[PDB]
């Protein structure tokens, strides 16, 4: 039997319909009959399915459901679609809100906005994994099994704590609000470049470019040791790829666009090395330094 009458429901999505409400497409959920044509239906759309019985079906909405670990370990249910098409990546600093519950709706952990580097995780394994599939502003409910929750050890009540019983499943509202792209720079990847402000179209200095920059250097506890090229100072310009500046700033700016603002995390072998740098404070030997960099303009080689 068959049917006559831009996006579509997939396998396992949560469809809402008028016929003559509201189920998991194509699981065990209706008479194994008429499921199998709702998946060609569009939102507004109005089909009449004929089974050898007739069904006037208005597909109202759906919510997608995603088996993101390929495991049934985490099912992601998208309750608000996010924007555009990028998902954040391991080295990204993401900003999120979530509320994690036990199956019985007991809130164990919750947050109204928290940033983390995605590869470091947060909360439990499920979060890092969910966000790596999520668009900006995506809001989801995650059905999490123990191995992506807190395992066997579960989790004790500390504060603001809910004990998670060893081997519990979890239900998590998660919203990916926004993120900042970290690229790993050097042969090494030891230099982190976090975009604060995206620059303008495509072009990047090349080796030997003369580059105008504003820079602010800080130690990891936030002490400013250097300011250079800011508006209240003479401008600061250097040629790139000549060791005109510490190596991590040279490599960062080669990967920067005009007008880009970046935080650049520079281990001491790419910075001041093993001797002290007496600036606004002293750079103690063996410091990783964070450099706020604004690529003002440049003239390619």
UniProtKB/Swiss-Prot annotation:
Biological role stated in the UniProt entry: PPIases accelerate the folding of proteins during protein synthesis.
GO MF term set: calmodulin binding; peptidyl-prolyl cis-trans isomerase activity
Span of domain PPIase FKBP-type: 91-180, 208-299
Signal peptide range in chain numbering: none
Induction entry: By heat shock.
One record GO biological process: chaperone-mediated protein folding
Subunit text: This PPIase probably binds calmodulin.
Gene: FKBP70
Catalysed reactions, semicolon-separated: [protein]-peptidylproline (omega=180) = [protein]-peptidylproline (omega=0)
UniProt EC number: 5.2.1.8
GO cellular component, one term: cytoplasm
Protein name in the entry: 70 kDa peptidyl-prolyl isomerase
Keywords of this entry: Calmodulin-binding, Isomerase, Repeat, Rotamase, Stress response, TPR repeat
Domain of life: Eukaryota
């Amino acid at each position: 039997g068959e049917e006559n009458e831009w996006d579509t429901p997939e396998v396992g999505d949560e469809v809402e319909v008028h016929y003559t409400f509201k189920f998991k497409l194509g699981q065990g959920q209706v008479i194994k009959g008429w499921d199998q044509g709702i998946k060609t239906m569009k939102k507004g759309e109005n089909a009449l399915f004929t089974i050898p019985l007739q069904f006037d079906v208005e597909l109202l909405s759906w919510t997608s459901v995603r088996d993101i670990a390929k495991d049934g370990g985490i099912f992601k249910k998208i309750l608000k679609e996010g924007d555009k098409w990028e998902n954040p990546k391991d080295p990204d600093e993401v900003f999120v809100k979530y509320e994690a519950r036990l199956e019985d709706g007991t809130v164990v952990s919750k947050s109204e906005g928290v940033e983390f580097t995605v590869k470091d995780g947060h909360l439990c394994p499920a979060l890092a994994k969910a966000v790596k599939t999520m668009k900006k502003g995506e809001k989801v409910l995650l059905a999490v099994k123990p191995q992506y929750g807190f395992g066997e050890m579960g989790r004790p009540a500390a504060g603001e704590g809910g004990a998670v019983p060893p081997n519990a499943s979890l239900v998590i509202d998660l919203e990916l609000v926004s993120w900042k792209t970290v690229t790993e720079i050097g042969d090494d990847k030891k230099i982190l470049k976090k975009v604060l402000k995206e620059x303008e179209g495509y072009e990047r200095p090349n080796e030997g470019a003369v580059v105008t920059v504003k820079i602010t250097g800080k130690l990891q506890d936030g002490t400013v040791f250097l300011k250079k090229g800011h508006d209240e100072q003479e401008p600061f310009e250097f040629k790139t790829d000549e060791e005109a500046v510490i190596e991590g700033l040279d490599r960062a700016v080669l990967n920067m666009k005009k007008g880009e603002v970046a935080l650049v995390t520079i281990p001491p072998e790419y910075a001041y090395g093993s001797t002290e740098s007496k600036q606004d404070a002293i750079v103690p030997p063996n410091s990783t330094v964070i450099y706020e960099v604004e690529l003002v303009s440049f003239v390619k080689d």
